[PDB]
PDB file of all heavy atoms in Angstrom:
ATOM      1  N   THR H  62       4.540   3.294  -2.807  1.00  2.00           N
ATOM      2  CA  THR H  62       4.091   4.726  -2.841  1.00  2.00           C
ATOM      3  C   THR H  62       4.379   5.235  -1.407  1.00  2.00           C
ATOM      4  O   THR H  62       3.692   4.968  -0.485  1.00  2.00           O
ATOM      5  CB  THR H  62       2.653   4.881  -3.275  1.00  2.00           C
ATOM      6  OG1 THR H  62       2.175   6.201  -2.938  1.00  2.00           O
ATOM      7  CG2 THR H  62       1.643   3.747  -2.766  1.00  2.00           C
ATOM      8  N   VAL H  63       5.552   5.984  -1.311  1.00  2.00           N
ATOM      9  CA  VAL H  63       6.126   6.448  -0.080  1.00  2.00           C
ATOM     10  C   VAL H  63       5.728   7.879   0.202  1.00  2.00           C
ATOM     11  O   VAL H  63       5.786   8.729  -0.734  1.00  2.00           O
ATOM     12  CB  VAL H  63       7.699   6.245  -0.089  1.00  2.00           C
ATOM     13  CG1 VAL H  63       8.326   6.914   1.142  1.00  2.00           C
ATOM     14  CG2 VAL H  63       8.063   4.816  -0.178  1.00  2.00           C
ATOM     15  N   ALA H  64       5.238   8.181   1.397  1.00  2.00           N
ATOM     16  CA  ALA H  64       4.869   9.522   1.797  1.00  2.00           C
ATOM     17  C   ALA H  64       5.760  10.005   2.879  1.00  2.00           C
ATOM     18  O   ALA H  64       6.025   9.256   3.834  1.00  2.00           O
ATOM     19  CB  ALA H  64       3.386   9.604   2.229  1.00  2.00           C
ATOM     20  N   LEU H  65       6.332  11.190   2.710  1.00  2.00           N
ATOM     21  CA  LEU H  65       7.236  11.797   3.687  1.00  2.00           C
ATOM     22  C   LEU H  65       6.491  12.903   4.458  1.00  2.00           C
ATOM     23  O   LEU H  65       5.854  13.768   3.892  1.00  2.00           O
ATOM     24  CB  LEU H  65       8.465  12.401   3.068  1.00  2.00           C
ATOM     25  CG  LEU H  65       9.430  11.448   2.423  1.00  2.00           C
ATOM     26  CD1 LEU H  65      10.797  12.061   2.518  1.00  2.00           C
ATOM     27  CD2 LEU H  65       9.374  10.121   3.023  1.00  2.00           C
ATOM     28  N   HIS H  66       6.568  12.812   5.783  1.00  2.00           N
ATOM     29  CA  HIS H  66       6.039  13.931   6.680  1.00  2.00           C
ATOM     30  C   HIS H  66       7.216  14.541   7.471  1.00  2.00           C
ATOM     31  O   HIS H  66       7.786  13.944   8.312  1.00  2.00           O
ATOM     32  CB  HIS H  66       5.048  13.325   7.614  1.00  2.00           C
ATOM     33  CG  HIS H  66       4.096  12.339   7.035  1.00  2.00           C
ATOM     34  ND1 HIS H  66       3.049  12.739   6.201  1.00  2.00           N
ATOM     35  CD2 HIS H  66       4.071  10.969   7.040  1.00  2.00           C
ATOM     36  CE1 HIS H  66       2.429  11.621   5.780  1.00  2.00           C
ATOM     37  NE2 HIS H  66       3.018  10.593   6.277  1.00  2.00           N
ATOM     38  N   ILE H  67       7.530  15.743   7.064  1.00  2.00           N
ATOM     39  CA  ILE H  67       8.643  16.460   7.643  1.00  2.00           C
ATOM     40  C   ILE H  67       8.057  17.456   8.647  1.00  2.00           C
ATOM     41  O   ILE H  67       7.154  18.189   8.344  1.00  2.00           O
ATOM     42  CB  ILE H  67       9.469  17.226   6.590  1.00  2.00           C
ATOM     43  CG1 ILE H  67       9.770  16.330   5.409  1.00  2.00           C
ATOM     44  CG2 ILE H  67      10.804  17.732   7.146  1.00  2.00           C
ATOM     45  CD1 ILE H  67      10.270  17.012   4.206  1.00  2.00           C
ATOM     46  N   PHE H  68       8.559  17.414   9.894  1.00  2.00           N
ATOM     47  CA  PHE H  68       8.029  18.195  10.933  1.00  2.00           C
ATOM     48  C   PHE H  68       9.188  18.731  11.764  1.00  2.00           C
ATOM     49  O   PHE H  68      10.266  18.268  11.790  1.00  2.00           O
ATOM     50  CB  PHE H  68       7.039  17.372  11.818  1.00  2.00           C
ATOM     51  CG  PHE H  68       7.675  16.252  12.527  1.00  2.00           C
ATOM     52  CD1 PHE H  68       8.137  16.360  13.828  1.00  2.00           C
ATOM     53  CD2 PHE H  68       7.820  14.947  11.916  1.00  2.00           C
ATOM     54  CE1 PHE H  68       8.713  15.323  14.516  1.00  2.00           C
ATOM     55  CE2 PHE H  68       8.397  13.929  12.557  1.00  2.00           C
ATOM     56  CZ  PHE H  68       8.848  14.082  13.872  1.00  2.00           C
ATOM     57  N   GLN H  69       8.844  19.814  12.492  1.00  2.00           N
ATOM     58  CA  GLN H  69       9.813  20.490  13.339  1.00  2.00           C
ATOM     59  C   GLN H  69       9.049  20.686  14.673  1.00  2.00           C
ATOM     60  O   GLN H  69       7.907  21.116  14.682  1.00  2.00           O
ATOM     61  CB  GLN H  69      10.152  21.808  12.779  1.00  2.00           C
ATOM     62  CG  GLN H  69      11.383  22.436  13.317  1.00  2.00           C
ATOM     63  CD  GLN H  69      12.026  23.311  12.341  1.00  2.00           C
ATOM     64  OE1 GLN H  69      11.541  23.468  11.208  1.00  2.00           O
ATOM     65  NE2 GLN H  69      13.120  23.954  12.759  1.00  2.00           N
ATOM     66  N   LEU H  70       9.693  20.258  15.776  1.00  2.00           N
ATOM     67  CA  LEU H  70       9.034  20.333  17.045  1.00  2.00           C
ATOM     68  C   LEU H  70       9.017  21.789  17.505  1.00  2.00           C
ATOM     69  O   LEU H  70       9.991  22.517  17.354  1.00  2.00           O
ATOM     70  CB  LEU H  70       9.643  19.433  18.109  1.00  2.00           C
ATOM     71  CG  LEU H  70       9.815  17.964  17.745  1.00  2.00           C
ATOM     72  CD1 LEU H  70      10.420  17.254  18.960  1.00  2.00           C
ATOM     73  CD2 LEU H  70       8.516  17.346  17.306  1.00  2.00           C
ATOM     74  N   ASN H  71       7.973  22.154  18.294  1.00  2.00           N
ATOM     75  CA  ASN H  71       7.791  23.442  18.834  1.00  2.00           C
ATOM     76  C   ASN H  71       8.182  23.428  20.297  1.00  2.00           C
ATOM     77  O   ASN H  71       7.495  22.921  21.097  1.00  2.00           O
ATOM     78  CB  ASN H  71       6.356  23.970  18.632  1.00  2.00           C
ATOM     79  CG  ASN H  71       6.101  24.510  17.247  1.00  2.00           C
ATOM     80  OD1 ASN H  71       6.136  23.746  16.245  1.00  2.00           O
ATOM     81  ND2 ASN H  71       5.833  25.800  17.165  1.00  2.00           N
ATOM     82  N   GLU H  72       9.378  23.983  20.635  1.00  2.00           N
ATOM     83  CA  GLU H  72       9.969  23.777  21.923  1.00  2.00           C
ATOM     84  C   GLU H  72       9.191  24.493  23.001  1.00  2.00           C
ATOM     85  O   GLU H  72       9.173  24.094  24.200  1.00  2.00           O
ATOM     86  CB  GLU H  72      11.434  24.164  21.996  1.00  2.00           C
ATOM     87  CG  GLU H  72      12.305  23.847  20.766  1.00  2.00           C
ATOM     88  CD  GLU H  72      12.838  22.397  20.768  1.00  2.00           C
ATOM     89  OE1 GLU H  72      12.935  21.762  21.822  1.00  2.00           O
ATOM     90  OE2 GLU H  72      13.254  21.947  19.624  1.00  2.00           O
ATOM     91  N   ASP H  73       8.537  25.640  22.667  1.00  2.00           N
ATOM     92  CA  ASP H  73       8.017  26.542  23.621  1.00  2.00           C
ATOM     93  C   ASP H  73       6.836  25.790  24.405  1.00  2.00           C
ATOM     94  O   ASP H  73       5.875  25.359  23.787  1.00  2.00           O
ATOM     95  CB  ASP H  73       7.465  27.784  22.987  1.00  2.00           C
ATOM     96  CG  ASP H  73       7.058  28.852  23.911  1.00  2.00           C
ATOM     97  OD1 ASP H  73       7.712  28.984  24.916  1.00  2.00           O
ATOM     98  OD2 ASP H  73       6.079  29.573  23.610  1.00  2.00           O
ATOM     99  N   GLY H  74       6.989  25.780  25.746  1.00  2.00           N
ATOM    100  CA  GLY H  74       6.083  25.020  26.598  1.00  2.00           C
ATOM    101  C   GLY H  74       5.500  25.808  27.798  1.00  2.00           C
ATOM    102  O   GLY H  74       6.151  26.740  28.330  1.00  2.00           O
ATOM    103  N   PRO H  75       4.323  25.413  28.261  1.00  2.00           N
ATOM    104  CA  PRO H  75       3.564  24.332  27.611  1.00  2.00           C
ATOM    105  C   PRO H  75       2.837  24.890  26.391  1.00  2.00           C
ATOM    106  O   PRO H  75       2.971  26.029  26.082  1.00  2.00           O
ATOM    107  CB  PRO H  75       2.545  23.872  28.646  1.00  2.00           C
ATOM    108  CG  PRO H  75       2.245  25.086  29.417  1.00  2.00           C
ATOM    109  CD  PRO H  75       3.537  25.871  29.440  1.00  2.00           C
ATOM    110  N   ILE H  76      -3.154  32.368  27.738  1.00  2.00           N
ATOM    111  CA  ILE H  76      -4.290  31.429  27.829  1.00  2.00           C
ATOM    112  C   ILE H  76      -4.552  31.035  29.265  1.00  2.00           C
ATOM    113  O   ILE H  76      -3.850  30.142  29.774  1.00  2.00           O
ATOM    114  CB  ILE H  76      -4.111  30.163  26.937  1.00  2.00           C
ATOM    115  N   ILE H  77      -5.489  31.695  29.918  1.00  2.00           N
ATOM    116  CA  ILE H  77      -5.825  31.389  31.318  1.00  2.00           C
ATOM    117  C   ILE H  77      -7.317  31.104  31.360  1.00  2.00           C
ATOM    118  O   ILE H  77      -8.150  31.891  30.806  1.00  2.00           O
ATOM    119  CB  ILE H  77      -5.422  32.651  32.193  1.00  2.00           C
ATOM    120  CG1 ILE H  77      -3.919  33.004  31.942  1.00  2.00           C
ATOM    121  CG2 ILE H  77      -5.660  32.384  33.733  1.00  2.00           C
ATOM    122  CD1 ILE H  77      -3.552  34.317  32.577  1.00  2.00           C
ATOM    123  N   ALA H  78      -7.703  30.025  32.066  1.00  2.00           N
ATOM    124  CA  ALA H  78      -6.747  29.037  32.543  1.00  2.00           C
ATOM    125  C   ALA H  78      -6.882  27.799  31.725  1.00  2.00           C
ATOM    126  O   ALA H  78      -7.894  27.089  31.842  1.00  2.00           O
ATOM    127  CB  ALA H  78      -6.964  28.787  33.984  1.00  2.00           C
ATOM    128  N   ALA H  79      -5.942  27.594  30.875  1.00  2.00           N
ATOM    129  CA  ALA H  79      -5.885  26.415  30.031  1.00  2.00           C
ATOM    130  C   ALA H  79      -4.434  26.225  29.591  1.00  2.00           C
ATOM    131  O   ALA H  79      -3.593  27.110  29.712  1.00  2.00           O
ATOM    132  CB  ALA H  79      -6.783  26.619  28.764  1.00  2.00           C
ATOM    133  N   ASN H  80      -4.122  24.973  29.301  1.00  2.00           N
ATOM    134  CA  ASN H  80      -2.852  24.611  28.771  1.00  2.00           C
ATOM    135  C   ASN H  80      -2.916  24.722  27.286  1.00  2.00           C
ATOM    136  O   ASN H  80      -3.857  24.198  26.655  1.00  2.00           O
ATOM    137  CB  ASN H  80      -2.478  23.211  29.265  1.00  2.00           C
ATOM    138  CG  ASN H  80      -2.651  22.990  30.748  1.00  2.00           C
ATOM    139  OD1 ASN H  80      -3.443  23.660  31.351  1.00  2.00           O
ATOM    140  ND2 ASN H  80      -1.886  22.041  31.328  1.00  2.00           N
ATOM    141  N   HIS H  81      -1.955  25.425  26.659  1.00  2.00           N
ATOM    142  CA  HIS H  81      -1.928  25.627  25.216  1.00  2.00           C
ATOM    143  C   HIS H  81      -0.571  25.203  24.667  1.00  2.00           C
ATOM    144  O   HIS H  81       0.450  25.625  25.162  1.00  2.00           O
ATOM    145  CB  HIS H  81      -2.196  27.071  24.844  1.00  2.00           C
ATOM    146  CG  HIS H  81      -1.973  27.368  23.418  1.00  2.00           C
ATOM    147  ND1 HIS H  81      -1.002  28.261  22.994  1.00  2.00           N
ATOM    148  CD2 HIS H  81      -2.437  26.849  22.285  1.00  2.00           C
ATOM    149  CE1 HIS H  81      -0.967  28.321  21.679  1.00  2.00           C
ATOM    150  NE2 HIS H  81      -1.845  27.448  21.210  1.00  2.00           N
ATOM    151  N   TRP H  82      -0.594  24.313  23.677  1.00  2.00           N
ATOM    152  CA  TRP H  82       0.610  23.813  23.007  1.00  2.00           C
ATOM    153  C   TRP H  82       0.539  24.034  21.526  1.00  2.00           C
ATOM    154  O   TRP H  82      -0.575  24.000  20.920  1.00  2.00           O
ATOM    155  CB  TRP H  82       0.790  22.344  23.215  1.00  2.00           C
ATOM    156  CG  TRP H  82       1.172  21.847  24.543  1.00  2.00           C
ATOM    157  CD1 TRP H  82       2.483  21.650  25.011  1.00  2.00           C
ATOM    158  CD2 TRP H  82       0.288  21.446  25.634  1.00  2.00           C
ATOM    159  NE1 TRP H  82       2.419  21.148  26.264  1.00  2.00           N
ATOM    160  CE2 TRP H  82       1.091  21.007  26.662  1.00  2.00           C
ATOM    161  CE3 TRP H  82      -1.098  21.352  25.741  1.00  2.00           C
ATOM    162  CZ2 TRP H  82       0.504  20.525  27.875  1.00  2.00           C
ATOM    163  CZ3 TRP H  82      -1.644  20.888  26.892  1.00  2.00           C
ATOM    164  CH2 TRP H  82      -0.825  20.488  27.978  1.00  2.00           C
ATOM    165  N   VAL H  83       1.688  24.207  20.876  1.00  2.00           N
ATOM    166  CA  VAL H  83       1.710  24.308  19.427  1.00  2.00           C
ATOM    167  C   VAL H  83       2.275  22.983  18.885  1.00  2.00           C
ATOM    168  O   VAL H  83       3.380  22.571  19.357  1.00  2.00           O
ATOM    169  CB  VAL H  83       2.586  25.548  18.936  1.00  2.00           C
ATOM    170  CG1 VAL H  83       2.603  25.609  17.463  1.00  2.00           C
ATOM    171  CG2 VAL H  83       2.003  26.768  19.600  1.00  2.00           C
ATOM    172  N   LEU H  84       1.541  22.382  17.977  1.00  2.00           N
ATOM    173  CA  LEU H  84       1.871  21.066  17.461  1.00  2.00           C
ATOM    174  C   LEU H  84       2.524  21.200  16.084  1.00  2.00           C
ATOM    175  O   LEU H  84       2.311  22.045  15.340  1.00  2.00           O
ATOM    176  CB  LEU H  84       0.537  20.299  17.332  1.00  2.00           C
ATOM    177  CG  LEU H  84      -0.293  20.312  18.604  1.00  2.00           C
ATOM    178  CD1 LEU H  84      -1.517  19.567  18.277  1.00  2.00           C
ATOM    179  CD2 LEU H  84       0.542  19.655  19.683  1.00  2.00           C
ATOM    180  N   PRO H  85       3.455  20.205  15.809  1.00  2.00           N
ATOM    181  CA  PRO H  85       4.052  19.206  16.707  1.00  2.00           C
ATOM    182  C   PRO H  85       4.745  19.764  17.946  1.00  2.00           C
ATOM    183  O   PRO H  85       5.702  20.507  17.763  1.00  2.00           O
ATOM    184  CB  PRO H  85       5.048  18.505  15.822  1.00  2.00           C
ATOM    185  CG  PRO H  85       4.534  18.647  14.478  1.00  2.00           C
ATOM    186  CD  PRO H  85       3.962  20.038  14.428  1.00  2.00           C
ATOM    187  N   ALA H  86       4.287  19.421  19.130  1.00  2.00           N
ATOM    188  CA  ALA H  86       4.892  19.917  20.349  1.00  2.00           C
ATOM    189  C   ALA H  86       6.079  19.076  20.780  1.00  2.00           C
ATOM    190  O   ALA H  86       6.115  17.832  20.519  1.00  2.00           O
ATOM    191  CB  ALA H  86       3.846  20.021  21.442  1.00  2.00           C
TER     192      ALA H  86
END
Side-chain angles (χ1 to χ4, degrees), residues 62-75 77-86:
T62 165
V63 173
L65 295 211
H66 319 282
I67 313 166
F68 62 94
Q69 196 155 358
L70 308 183
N71 279 68
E72 319 277 340
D73 190 34
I77 308 167
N80 311 26
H81 170 242
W82 290 267
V83 182
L84 310 176

